[PDB]
Amino acid sequence: ETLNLQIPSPTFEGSTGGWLRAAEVEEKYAITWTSPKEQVFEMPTGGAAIMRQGENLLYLARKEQCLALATQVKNSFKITDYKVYRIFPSGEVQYLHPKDGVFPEKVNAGRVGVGNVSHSIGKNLNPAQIKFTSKSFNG
Amino acid sequence: DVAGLTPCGESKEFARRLDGSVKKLQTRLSKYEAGTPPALALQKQIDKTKNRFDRYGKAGLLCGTDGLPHLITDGRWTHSGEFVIPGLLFLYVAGWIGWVGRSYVLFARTADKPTEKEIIIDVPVALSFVSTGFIWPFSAFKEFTSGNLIVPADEITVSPR
Amino acid sequence: MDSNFLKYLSTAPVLFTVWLSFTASFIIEANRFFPDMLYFPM
Amino acid sequence: SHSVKVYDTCIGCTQCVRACPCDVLEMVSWDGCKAGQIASAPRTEDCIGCKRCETACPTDFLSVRVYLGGETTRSMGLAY
Amino acid sequence: KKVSITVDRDPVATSFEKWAQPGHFSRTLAKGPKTTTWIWNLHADVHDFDSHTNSLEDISRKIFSAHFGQLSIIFLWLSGMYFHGARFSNYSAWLSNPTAVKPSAQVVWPIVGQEVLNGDVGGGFQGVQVTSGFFQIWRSSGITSEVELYWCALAGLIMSGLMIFAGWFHYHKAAPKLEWFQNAESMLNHHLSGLLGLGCLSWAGHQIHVSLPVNKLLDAGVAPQEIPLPHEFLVNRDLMAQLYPSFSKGLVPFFTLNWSEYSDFLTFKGGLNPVTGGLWLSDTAHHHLALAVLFIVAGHMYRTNWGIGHSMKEILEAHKGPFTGEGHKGLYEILTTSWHAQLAINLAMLGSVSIIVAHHMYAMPPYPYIATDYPTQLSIFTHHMWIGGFCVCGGAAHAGIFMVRDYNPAQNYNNLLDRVIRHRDAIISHLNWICIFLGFHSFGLYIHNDTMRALGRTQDMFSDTAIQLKPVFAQWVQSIHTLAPGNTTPNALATASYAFGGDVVAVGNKVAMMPISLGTADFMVHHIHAFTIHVTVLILLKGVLFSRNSRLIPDKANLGFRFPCDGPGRGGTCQSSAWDSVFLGLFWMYNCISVVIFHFSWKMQSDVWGTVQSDGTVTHITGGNFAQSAITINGWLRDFLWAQASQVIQSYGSALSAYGLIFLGAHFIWAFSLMFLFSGRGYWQELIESIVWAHNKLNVAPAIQPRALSITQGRAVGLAHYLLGGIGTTWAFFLARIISVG
Amino acid sequence: QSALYTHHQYIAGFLMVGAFAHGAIFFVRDYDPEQNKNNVLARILDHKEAIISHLSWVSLFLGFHTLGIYVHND
Amino acid sequence: VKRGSKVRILRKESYWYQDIGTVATIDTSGIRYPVVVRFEKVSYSGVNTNNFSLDEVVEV
Amino acid sequence: GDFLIHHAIALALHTTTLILVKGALDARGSKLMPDKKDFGYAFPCDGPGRGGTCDISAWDAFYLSMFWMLNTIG
Numbered sequence A: 001e002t003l004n005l006q007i008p009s010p011t012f013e014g015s016t017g018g019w020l021r022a023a024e025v026e027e028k029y030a031i032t033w034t035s036p037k038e039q040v041f042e043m044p045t046g047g048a049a050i051m052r053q054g055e056n057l058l059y060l061a062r063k064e065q066c067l068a069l070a071t072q073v074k075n076s077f078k079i080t081d082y083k084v085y086r087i088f089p090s091g092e093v094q095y096l097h098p099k100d101g102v103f104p105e106k107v108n109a110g111r112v113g114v115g116n117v118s119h120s121i122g123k124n125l126n127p128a129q130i131k132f133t134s135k136s137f138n139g
Numbered sequence B: 001d002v003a004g005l006t007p008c009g010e011s012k013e014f015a016r017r018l019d020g021s022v023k024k025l026q027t028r029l030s031k032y033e034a035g036t037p038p039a040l041a042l043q044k045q046i047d048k049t050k051n052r053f054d055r056y057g058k059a060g061l062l063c064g065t066d067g068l069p070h071l072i073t074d075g076r077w078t079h080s081g082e083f084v085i086p087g088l089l090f091l092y093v094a095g096w097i098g099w100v101g102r103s104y105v106l107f108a109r110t111a112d113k114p115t116e117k118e119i120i121i122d123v124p125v126a127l128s129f130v131s132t133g134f135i136w137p138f139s140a141f142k143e144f145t146s147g148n149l150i151v152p153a154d155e156i157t158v159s160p161r
Numbered sequence C: 001m002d003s004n005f006l007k008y009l010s011t012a013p014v015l016f017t018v019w020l021s022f023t024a025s026f027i028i029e030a031n032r033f034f035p036d037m038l039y040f041p042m
Numbered sequence D: 001s002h003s004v005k006v007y008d009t010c011i012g013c014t015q016c017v018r019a020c021p022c023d024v025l026e027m028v029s030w031d032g033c034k035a036g037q038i039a040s041a042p043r044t045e046d047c048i049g050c051k052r053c054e055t056a057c058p059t060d061f062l063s064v065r066v067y068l069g070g071e072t073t074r075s076m077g078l079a080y
Numbered sequence E: 001k002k003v004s005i006t007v008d009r010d011p012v013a014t015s016f017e018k019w020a021q022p023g024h025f026s027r028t029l030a031k032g033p034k035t036t037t038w039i040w041n042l043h044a045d046v047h048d049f050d051s052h053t054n055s056l057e058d059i060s061r062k063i064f065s066a067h068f069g070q071l072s073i074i075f076l077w078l079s080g081m082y083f084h085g086a087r088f089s090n091y092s093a094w095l096s097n098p099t100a101v102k103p104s105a106q107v108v109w110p111i112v113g114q115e116v117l118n119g120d121v122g123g124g125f126q127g128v129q130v131t132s133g134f135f136q137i138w139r140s141s142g143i144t145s146e147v148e149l150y151w152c153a154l155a156g157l158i159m160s161g162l163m164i165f166a167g168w169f170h171y172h173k174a175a176p177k178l179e180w181f182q183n184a185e186s187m188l189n190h191h192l193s194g195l196l197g198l199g200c201l202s203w204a205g206h207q208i209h210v211s212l213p214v215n216k217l218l219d220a221g222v223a224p225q226e227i228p229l230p231h232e233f234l235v236n237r238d239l240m241a242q243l244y245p246s247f248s249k250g251l252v253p254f255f256t257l258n259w260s261e262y263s264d265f266l267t268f269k270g271g272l273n274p275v276t277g278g279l280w281l282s283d284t285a286h287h288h289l290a291l292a293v294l295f296i297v298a299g300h301m302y303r304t305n306w307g308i309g310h311s312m313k314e315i316l317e318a319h320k321g322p323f324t325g326e327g328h329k330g331l332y333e334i335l336t337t338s339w340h341a342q343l344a345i346n347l348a349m350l351g352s353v354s355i356i357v358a359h360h361m362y363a364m365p366p367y368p369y370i371a372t373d374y375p376t377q378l379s380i381f382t383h384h385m386w387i388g389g390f391c392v393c394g395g396a397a398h399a400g401i402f403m404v405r406d407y408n409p410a411q412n413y414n415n416l417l418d419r420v421i422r423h424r425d426a427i428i429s430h431l432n433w434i435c436i437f438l439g440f441h442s443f444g445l446y447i448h449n450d451t452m453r454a455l456g457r458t459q460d461m462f463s464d465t466a467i468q469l470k471p472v473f474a475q476w477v478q479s480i481h482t483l484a485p486g487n488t489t490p491n492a493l494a495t496a497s498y499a500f501g502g503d504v505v506a507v508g509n510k511v512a513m514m515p516i517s518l519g520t521a522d523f524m525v526h527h528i529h530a531f532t533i534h535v536t537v538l539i540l541l542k543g544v545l546f547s548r549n550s551r552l553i554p555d556k557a558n559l560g561f562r563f564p565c566d567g568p569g570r571g572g573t574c575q576s577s578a579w580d581s582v583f584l585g586l587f588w589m590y591n592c593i594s595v596v597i598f599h600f601s602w603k604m605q606s607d608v609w610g611t612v613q614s615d616g617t618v619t620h621i622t623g624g625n626f627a628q629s630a631i632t633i634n635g636w637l638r639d640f641l642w643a644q645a646s647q648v649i650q651s652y653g654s655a656l657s658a659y660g661l662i663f664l665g666a667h668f669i670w671a672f673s674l675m676f677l678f679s680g681r682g683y684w685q686e687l688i689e690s691i692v693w694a695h696n697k698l699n700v701a702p703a704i705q706p707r708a709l710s711i712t713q714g715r716a717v718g719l720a721h722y723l724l725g726g727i728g729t730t731w732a733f734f735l736a737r738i739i740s741v742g
Numbered sequence F: 001q002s003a004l005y006t007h008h009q010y011i012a013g014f015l016m017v018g019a020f021a022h023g024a025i026f027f028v029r030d031y032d033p034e035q036n037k038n039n040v041l042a043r044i045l046d047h048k049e050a051i052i053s054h055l056s057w058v059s060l061f062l063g064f065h066t067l068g069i070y071v072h073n074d
Numbered sequence G: 001v002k003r004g005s006k007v008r009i010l011r012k013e014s015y016w017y018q019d020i021g022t023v024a025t026i027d028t029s030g031i032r033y034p035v036v037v038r039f040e041k042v043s044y045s046g047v048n049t050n051n052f053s054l055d056e057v058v059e060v
Numbered sequence H: 001g002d003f004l005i006h007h008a009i010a011l012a013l014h015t016t017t018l019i020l021v022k023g024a025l026d027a028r029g030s031k032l033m034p035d036k037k038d039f040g041y042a043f044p045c046d047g048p049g050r051g052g053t054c055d056i057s058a059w060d061a062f063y064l065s066m067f068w069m070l071n072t073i074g
């Protein structure tokens, strides 16, 4: 499960669009995926890179950059084998996506619903009713 | 006269307006020979200017201290030709246009594709409608009293509030 | 005359341009024969 | 973070979940609708506030609602 | 013979059916309107061919026939200019007295008193004075009569009919295949050799056989109806050898390479003709002959069907060094498969050429009697500066459309585009720093001067009579150009332009051209120009470089070239598309070109144009106030805008009252644009809801549901009315001012 | 005299905008529709499209003809 | 109601609140919003159909 | 001249009143945002969906009426 730090990165000549000091002092994101070919893709941060046949690994600054690349690999090269991690400067690696092995757009057992409100949106409470009160506007 | 104004026919400033307007054209005419096209053009403009000033003087318009006609619009009948009668003519034409456009939007609602009738107008039917507008006051008031002009408040979509 | 060409002449921009050109045109003609009508003559 | 809510008018179309660029939303099981599923917002700390989910939602008024709140590095979209 | 003609016969049927079906060209619009947005979406996307069709062949066919349609419109326009010169103009009177008669080729009908616009332009004529410089063109061509203007009008109509026929034929009857359009070597060979080279050679032949004898007789003083018709010069070689004795030798000196025989009519004089204040037409004839020779030579460079020539692909791929990776590899494929990439290049070059035209035509006046027709000089400089600025901003618009749509990273690995995109932060941060440095040290000098003059400290100002910022490099270049005749251009007799220095050329006691001295005010306003150009480049380049993705939006290419935003998150991403940098860069183009045309107008009135009184002293239009008043903003406000707006605002009741009305109307349209620019769509949709309610109440709601304009369309409408109002206000101000005083 | 008139009219315009702004803040934040059942306030909100459309008409009515007469005379 | 009947919408936040639609289907399960209603106007999203209940739908 | 400027003042008053009244009465909700009161008085927009919602808050109607107040006092 854990990120194998030794996975070879896709060939890239560098760019100014990569990560900055905030990645080495706050958090960094990593994405791995399997390619059946040694083929050119577009980096979210700049120009073009070449993914190597076998396992690839990238480092990006934002989670949205890792997922924009994931969307791209799935749409064009049909690579659904992508795993997205968060990495803290303490060395702790946090697996992110897909969070339970199944893509979020597919249902899975053992997922608990967060944020679900039992009524429709027009049944919320008026702001005056909950003024100087801690009660939430969602009923 | 009304509001301390002077009839334009006896205003001295109106007369100086007419004279200055004609001297300005005559000095442009002083630079052309008699039968030339610019001479005929300016002589026809001097005739038009004099005709306008003469017509304004004899119409019952009132001039100010500046020598320009002023319009009285308080409702008095001696001056109804400046706002009340042009206004009646306008409201007849405007109500015609509104009545005819409304008749066509109600026709177009009962069409096979109602929104195609509004970018491609059915010209024979729309001309049938434009002819009907000459009696819009009677048609529209009978439409009103027969309960077909105004829709009740509960068939109109409104914001939740 | 072709029914598709007449269906083209019934389109909104053509009718709008023709009707407002005809409208502008009889305002222009009325002000040619009857100019400087500041008031309804009465 | 931003606050994302799903109301019980959700028809379980999964469109919000597919449109989210930051994997905030996912589908959970629910007997209320015909599709047998409802959208959920377990990872709002990653919500950037793009409101692509609200754009994707087809119910008459949005079943998913984003309420922009306190800003963080994640929700500000800062790569620096 | 891999360069061949290939055509599909009868591709598209000439039918009126799709005329009756608005929106037929796209799948979205073809199903009909449901909201008013459909109407706007119909017009917005109609000539976006590569948005309707996938195939490059159908796109190319549509483009070729639409270019024939544009040519048909241009020929109709030219034919109308010739017909109005023939029928409704004082051209014949102007030929006799070019310095007294004011050109006029537009006459108004008398309807609501508007016949006051028929002012006394001279020559027993009344009409609207025209400033396009057509009269001087016709005199340079050697027209000399309204009859020949009728024949030019008919030639324009025939060409217009042939172009609209060719567009119909080449779309509906015989449409070329994609492999015909993808012949870049053949197209360049024919357009250099055939179009430009034979265009120049044929025009040189006309100048030599018609323009030179007719204009020599005119400048000798012969009356226009006393001058032989242009074909009697073609036949009677003795009559031509009277004016130019070299014609006694015929074409033997040309073929035997004894070219110095032709120095009668192929000169290298330089300077201006003293009689007309224009370029020597013998120089223009030699210029066009020499340009013809090397355009025909240049159109033999590329390889078509016989092995001689260059392959443009090989030239591009061979130019690569150690800093730039694979080099120009893949650029041929880009420029032979993307119309947008070609349009980006060709629009930037055409706009630059129009800006060069504006500078070169005021400084080296090419036509007879155009230099002392000051309304024409100001009109054609201002007009070609605006055409140049617009076309440059469309070059960056179509560079963005290419990057968003036609760019493919797989075919562009490690070449020049890949490397520009991979250091776009270094480019945009250094340009950003330059624009800040250059606004501080150009406009901040103006603010320093406003403050010092206001505080009573005139010894602390940047001025000629104080701390001096002299343009030594520009002054040095002017020195070299005055020294060039006989020194570094030894066979030239005069300077290229008297703007560099030298004599005062006066025609009809008005200055044609005279040295344009550069001082502290010129240093300041040239750095104003460099600042506004650098900022416009910054906005347009940042839009092109970040069109596909940013640190802000990592997938900007999936949203397209033209999208309003990607939501209020990430702090807010309003105006993040490449379209929105074209939108923002057209404001800065407007700012740049407005300062350029103001600099030209004030400098020419203050230091060049005017009247030459006895003793050779020159009285300029505004009396040399540029030097001491263009160094402060208060000087530009008071001595240029306030002082020179006197003619527009006092124009009521004269022939220039139309300019007074357009001055006010354009002020209106400009202000009205700010309603669309400062506002948002959500307010206007909620207001439309209450208006829709009042229609529902009377049962008169439309079936095409009214919508507020889109976010992008609110921006486009605001920008269109802003530019229309601002350019219109300057158009009226410039024309009434220079018609009254010049 | 000129400065005093201008000063107090600008103060007047700011105070009038602020009164409408704080009425909007009242409706958003402090208005409870259930303590105001069928009031003058609730009935105002009940015919807010009649109010807004008749302001729209009178603004357009004034604008078309005032600007039309000014442009007429111009 | 029944399939095919014309109904006046009573959901105050519907785009078609107090407008007329026509009922397409009615679910029989434990669905919270079982009435499917189609309209001739599109909403601001360009949708012309929506699910409702029985207290927010009245026959006309 | 006083007649024409009085009508211009009336046009300016009724239009500033329109913008401010429309902001106050649509503050709680509208058809684009029927739940506008849940977001407050001053929020940027509701995003690009539903056609676009720039300047949809009641605060933005204060913002827009400030230009018309400046115009009328002018």
Ligand code: CLA
Pocket: C014, C017, C018, C021, E076, E077, E079, E080, E081, E083, E084, E088, E106, E107, E108, E109
């Ligand atoms: C191409 C540029 C151009 C321009 C800008 C002008 C401009 C003008 N011309 Mg010139 N003209 C031109 C070319 C041009 N002309 C050419 C090529 C010729 C040679 C045939 C002439 C010959 C000519 C003459 C002989 C005269 C003018 C006149 C005029 C003036 C008034 C025209 C007018 O009001 O008639 C308006 C006439 C109408 C019939 C109104 C038509 C309005 C319709 C509705 C426009 C609709 C277009 C249509 C909807 C397009 C879609 C088609 C449809 C199937 C959908 C005006 C200054 C007049 C002038 O200067 O008098 C002193 C005049 O007498 N022109």
Ligand code: CLA
Pocket: E063, E064, E067, E068, E071, E180, E181, E183, E186, E187, E190, E191, E193, E194, E195
């Ligand atoms: C000698 C050959 C030749 C010449 C003169 C031209 C000329 C032109 N081409 Mg090109 N073209 C050529 C060969 C040539 N082409 C070849 C071989 C190809 C295939 C690779 C193309 C493919 C091509 C495309 C794809 C396009 C053009 C376009 C154009 C026009 C550019 C706009 C312009 O400046 O027109 C204005 C300038 C003019 C001088 C107008 C002249 C009109 C006629 C057609 C010029 C020639 C007349 C005739 C030969 C002269 C007779 C002289 C006689 C009196 C003695 C222009 C008419 C563009 C266009 O507008 O298409 C219509 C365009 O999109 N051409």
Ligand code: CLA
Pocket: B097, B098, B099, B100, B101, B102, B104, B121, B126, B127, B129, B130, E690, E691, E692, E694, E695, E698, E700, F053, F054, F056, F057, F060
């Ligand atoms: C004939 C159709 C028609 C009718 C009966 C009405 C009727 C009304 N409109 Mg609407 N309106 C229409 C068309 C129509 N409108 C169109 C096309 C527009 C878009 C420009 C508007 C924009 C509009 C606004 C912005 C407002 C109204 C308002 C009003 C009301 C007061 C009258 C008024 O202010 O007129 C004003 C009319 C205009 C500003 C524009 C009218 C433009 C032309 C002249 C009308 C359309 C002619 C049409 C093409 C007919 C073709 C018929 C043919 C096919 C047979 C009243 C409910 C006001 C309101 O709600 O007050 C209660 C208001 O604020 N209307």
Ligand code: CLA
Pocket: E078, E132, E133, E134, E137, E349, E350, E351, E353, E354, E357, E361, E380, E383, E384, E387
């Ligand atoms: C919307 C576009 C537009 C409009 C309406 C005008 C309008 C005008 N132009 Mg301008 N012009 C434009 C764009 C435009 N221009 C652009 C983009 C360029 C740059 C190529 C020029 C360059 C230009 C020149 C050089 C001249 C005009 C002149 C004129 C005036 C007379 C028109 C005429 O008969 O031409 C007549 C034009 C000529 C007699 C000579 C033209 C010679 C050039 C070199 C021909 C080049 C053609 C070639 C195919 C273009 C290649 C472009 C290159 C980048 C490859 C008129 C004010 C003339 C003027 O100021 O007269 C007072 C003039 O001499 N124009």
Ligand code: CLA
Pocket: E043, E044, E045, E046, E047, E048, E049, E343, E347, E390, E391, E392, E393, E394, E395, E397, E398, E401, E561, E562, E579, E582, E583, E586, E720, E724
């Ligand atoms: C040779 C020149 C040329 C060509 C062929 C094109 C072609 C194209 N451009 Mg480019 N463009 C150009 C020059 C050019 N442009 C210039 C000079 C600019 C700078 C302003 C741009 C800026 C630009 C942008 C920003 C965009 C395009 C887009 C497009 C495409 C869609 C065109 C369309 O449907 O519009 C339809 C045409 C109209 C709606 C016309 C209305 C435009 C104005 C407001 C009307 C003109 C006002 C008039 C002149 C004055 C009125 C007088 C007044 C007093 C009443 C098309 C491929 C669009 C696209 O998506 O491409 C993929 C796009 O987004 N272009």
Ligand code: CLA
Pocket: E668, E671, E672, E673, E674, E675, E676, E678, E679, E687, F056, F059, F060, F061, F062, F063, F064, F067, H015, H018, H019, H064, H065, H067, H068
């Ligand atoms: C000079 C600038 C200007 C002008 C004229 C307007 C005009 C208007 N604004 Mg806008 N506004 C402006 C600046 C301007 N605003 C600015 C800077 C802001 C700050 C962002 C706003 C913010 C604003 C808001 C927030 C609101 C308005 C509203 C209004 C309307 C109020 C006046 C009215 O109801 O009838 C006056 C009507 C007119 C002046 C229309 C003129 C008639 C035209 C010119 C007819 C000409 C037709 C002609 C043939 C077209 C030729 C086209 C050509 C291509 C052929 C009117 C449409 C309000 C509104 O719409 O309520 C109804 C509204 O709510 N405006």
Ligand SMILES: CC1=CCCC(C)(C)[C@H]1/C=C/C(C)=C/C=C/C(C)=C/C=C/C=C(C)/C=C/C=C(C)/C=C/C1=C(C)CCCC1(C)C
Pocket: F019, F020, F022, F023, F024, F026, H021, H024
């Ligand atoms: C937005 C909003 C939401 C809800 C809450 C909220 C704060 C309440 C609200 C704000 C509302 C706001 C901001 C409302 C603003 C309301 C205003 C500015 C009302 C102005 C009223 C003036 C009147 C009635 C003058 C009467 C003069 C007369 C009768 C003179 C008579 C005469 C005399 C005596 C002498 C001369 C002769 C004549 C002419 C005969």
Ligand SMILES: CC1=C(C/C=C(\C)CCC[C@H](C)CCC[C@H](C)CCCC(C)C)C(=O)c2ccccc2C1=O
Pocket: E675, E676, E677, E679, E680, E681, E684, E685, E707, E708, E709, E710, E711, E713, E714, E715
């Ligand atoms: C006034 C305004 C509207 C409403 C404007 C509308 C509905 C345009 C009105 C057009 C009417 C329907 C026709 C009048 C057109 C003119 C008479 C001439 C138009 C010329 C071209 C359209 C051909 C917006 O939708 C908007 C959106 C985003 C930012 C700012 C704004 C904004 O300021």
Ligand code: SF4
Pocket: D006, D009, D010, D011, D012, D013, D014, D015, D016, D017, D038, D039, D056, D057, D058, D059, D062, D063, D064
């Ligand atoms: S989009 Fe709206 S409806 Fe479809 S799933 Fe997400 S929330 Fe439920």
Ligand code: SF4
Pocket: D002, D004, D019, D020, D021, D022, D023, D024, D025, D046, D047, D048, D049, D050, D051, D052, D053, D054, D066
């Ligand atoms: S707002 Fe953007 S990020 Fe937050 S949930 Fe909706 S889509 Fe995912």
Ligand code: SF4
Pocket: E564, E565, E566, E567, E568, E572, E573, E574, E575, E680, E711, H044, H045, H046, H047, H048, H052, H053, H054, H055
């Ligand atoms: S909607 Fe209007 S405001 Fe909200 S983000 Fe898109 S553009 Fe900016």
